[PDB]
């Protein structure tokens, strides 16, 4: 992680691609703002775990 | 004046009471062949169904 | 008397704040959900204009001989005459205030002579029955007549123009927002959004109850007891 | 002689029927049009005064 | 008086918003679920036109000698005569307003002379019994007779044409949507959709209760007490 | 008066929407579950025609000497005489309206002379006892007699032809669907489907309660008090 | 003769109608305008004094 | 009489403390959510000025011949005359106190002669009906007339200037904050924020109940019984 | 992941194929819009875990 | 007994035209009376309508 | 003075009772061709619909 | 009939406006051909 959102790391890339895959719904209805953020927040554990696996 | 049996019903009844005279007029139109004058083809097309003979004044 | 453009903005900040179509400046609604929101405001005003007596309007209806049933639609009016669906116009409206097809309930109809004619009175010649809410059945179209029909009215239909002005009491705008929120949040079919729709809908009743518990929509009525002197009672 | 209608019982035109003599229709869920719709009367003189 | 095309759009934005057949522009319904929605609107209007007295119509029924049972169907009418299933036509309708087979309940039938004939009166010669809701059993077809039959009516059947106009009060459109939503969401048999169907159906009753708690559908009735003078009582 | 073909389609869109046998066009029912659905409509109409008095029909029963018990079956009729199970025909029906074996309850039987005969009156010579609902026990078959038997009736049995027309009030079609849904969803024995069957069955009662709370099935009865003048009481 | 209106029953102008003779409309949820809106009267003389 | 700038700061410390747009100094609100907060204060004051009678103002309305309907908008005033939407000005306001379009309910209107004219009295010539809350229908525009219209008022609209002063009782500022918190926290659609919105909204009622349980907003009214001497009663 | 929905990565491909396998239901009834999105959101954990396994 | 609300309903905004006409009935009557004196020039199309003028025609101007 | 039938209704009725005279004036304007004088083109453009002939005093 | 009078006035509103404008626009050229009668013209008579 480059310690910045949308950085040039692997944690950032995965964590900014999951949000870019959920914003495709939020910007087309089908979920309110609150639901989208909750999904985004509950992904940090998965992205961080999978970023280390990919990096190493 | 304002009729008690209804304004339009008075007209309908008045037409009804004169059906016999209108029946005679319709019969005379229907049986005796009639020739009529017409200005153009559109007016000729707009003729009644008992008009057998016509004449187009060009 | 706010404008539909302002209603879009105030909706984007209070009720539809987490909605997807909220633009990046947060002070407007994107051009893809505007038909949806406009279809919710129009229903919202219709409900609010139905419970409370908010707009009482009268449109005079001239008598045409041979016609007894007099639908109060806009196709029969003068300024909006539609020759394809109406044989002759019989309602009367001025160009500045045309008929807007906004009759919810007909309340009291007078005549061209000043004689009040009862409504839905089976045993009452000189009575105008209404066979369906937006109609009128005068059984004797006398000569030189007309009918000032006082009726409950709804807000004129919001076409979509962002310069059309909205006739709502300022105290009832906190209830129109809570009904747009209900309609919007209840269609997503998600558990989180559905539970929010109920809260917004129940708040609609709470605000519509405080408006009727303080006479902010002119619901309480008092009249002089003219019946007293007529029945005798010196 | 100051009738006090409850706020919600008689809707529009159903109070105009009431204030004209004609039979009216009331919403049952609000109450009863014999214990509500109060017709205020003279108070009862205390026995102490007499 | 809205159109079925407009009803499709307003349904697509409020009730059937999460439905699958909503087109990409979100302002219409795809051509594969339209038969389904149309079959829900038709049932929706039938229920609404059954509880409230929304459409009171009268169709005159001429007497044909030898026939006592007079079904009020559309096959026996004049403009819609069906020679394969009707021997002779006896109802009377004009070309502009043909009989639409829309009788729910028969309320009051007069005669060609003005004499009111009672309904379902066992001991009452001069009484027209109805052996089934859409029939009529006159036991004495006198010469030169007819019967203006005032009956509760339903909305004429919506064939599917997107230019057919819908006769519903503007205040009751928030209840037709909540019934289409009920019918649609209850058929998916999923736990999430079923729980939404109950909410939409219960809201149908709530709106149908506010319409009857404010006399927006003309349900309250008052009549002159003509019985008083007849029973004596000077 | 809809047709069984239309009932199949309307069932496929509202009640049996998630059912397996729904064809790919979604507007019909596959040819493997049609016997099942038809066996549910027939039961559905029987229940609806049992609670409400929807079809009151009378079939005259001629007297044959030596026979006192007169079962009102279709094997004893004239147009449907079955020589293998009936010695002689004694009911009378026309070819256009044959007897359909549709007696649920017998209500009132007159005679060939106009004398009303009481039903189930132990101490009443001139009384026709019914030892079982679809029978009749006249204890004195007098010469030249007949019996117009007014009885509650059920809808004639739906054989399966898709051109047979269904006699149901338009307001009660939202209850026939909710009973077909109950019968279908309750047989799958799955927890999800069973819980839906209860909802559909309870909705059947709710609609069957609104029909009886608004007199849409002609249940309320008023008659002239002819007893008053007979007991004296000048 | 000291009428005691409950705080919330009669809104604005619905108490001005009341204090002028005209028919008024009251909020049902607050109470009943015959047991509330108390018209204080003379107390009842104890039998002990007499 | 605080200022909108101070209201921003006091809101940032008590109600909107966990809000995102709170600046780094914690004593102000960022320039991206200010339209949102301002749209909540304006609604907040409107609700508070609706329940309680907080601002009673009177604006005189001159009579113009030929005009009976007199909308009390700001386009018809003198200092804010809008020639595009008003033919002539008839309200009267001074430059220091212009009309602010702030009529919620009209309470009592006098005349230029001192004669009080009743409101909404069907049988009362000399009565000014109001066909909609912000209008006035005088049926006889006599010469040399005017109408001091005492009406309930709302706080003048907060444009957004941080130097506009707010007219609220100091004891009711703990209720305006609890309503801004409700409006803000209820739009996030998150479970944590929604549950906080209910607490803030319920506290709004609790404070609005303590203000009315101690007569801090001048709600209790006592008047001399002038009716006594008029009805006789020596 | 290419940090864009429907990208040219493995996370995107798996996450845009599961959504293209659930939209086959949503566009044919059998689920409302809300149910489809909830299923789509609860797949991110699975797709991200299986994308790393496939990539490496 | 006041019919002014009817005027507001029908001739509401354009009542200024009616008021301006009402203030000028005397001027309109004077204009008509001077008009009948034919003390002016009248425009006529072609010579044909020149003959078709009142016995009191005092000037005329023919176009073409 | 303050009219009982309404201040504006009195004016409307007064105009109504004089329609015949106004009808004669309108007829005389309509049938007898009129030539009028005009200062500029803008005023000429602002002429009534029954004004057939004009004259622009430059 | 108040409605009849008001409607009769309203249907002739355009002609009333035309007549009032013609009265205000009054510019009919009057032929005098003599200074004496030209000096004896009314105050509203412009153009001669």
Residue numbers in the entry:
A (entry chain C), I (entry chain C): 57 to 112
B (entry chain D), K (entry chain D): 30 to 87
C (entry chain B), E (entry chain B), F (entry chain B), H (entry chain B): 1 to 234
D (entry chain A), G (entry chain A): 407 to 456
J (entry chain E): 24 to 87
L (entry chain F): 36 to 83
Can you list sentences taken from the study reporting this PDB entry?
We were able to clearly model several proteins with our C12-symmetrized maps including most residues for the portal proteins, tail adaptor proteins, and tail tubes for both Moo19 and B2. In addition, we were able to model the N-terminal residues of the tailspike proteins for both Moo19 and B2 but not the full-length proteins using the cryo-EM data as these are likely highly flexible at the linkage site. The adaptor proteins were largely complete with all 234 residues modeled for Moo19 and residues 2 to 233 of 234 total for B2. Last, the tail tube shown in blue was modeled for residues 4 to 278 of 279 for Moo19 and residues 3 to 200 of 206 for B2. The tail tube of Moo19 (gp71) and the tail tube of B2 (gp34) both share a high sequence homology (>80%) with a number of phages that infect enteric hosts such as Shigella, Salmonella, Escherichia, Klebsiella, etc. In addition, Moo19 and B2 have C12 symmetry and not the proposed C15 symmetry of DEV. Moo19 has an extra side appendage (composed of gp81, which is observed in the mass spectrometry data shown in Table 1). In G7C, this appendage is hypothesized to expand the host range; however, Moo19 and B2 have the same host range, so the function of gp81 in Moo19 is unclear at this time. Three major structural differences (see cartoon representation in Fig. 3B) include (i) the lack of the tail appendage, (ii) a single tailspike for Moo19 and a complex of two proteins for B2 (see next two paragraphs), and (iii) the completely different decoration proteins.
We isolated and characterized two Shigella podophages that have notably different features when compared with classical podophages and instead are most closely related to phage N4. We describe the isolation and characterization of phages Moo19 and B2, including whole-genome sequencing and analysis, cryo–electron microscopy (cryo-EM) structure determination, mass spectrometry, host range studies, and enzymatic assays of the tail proteins. Moo19 and B2 are similar to bacteriophage N4—these are all T = 9 podophages, which encapsidate their own polymerases—a hallmark of this phage family.
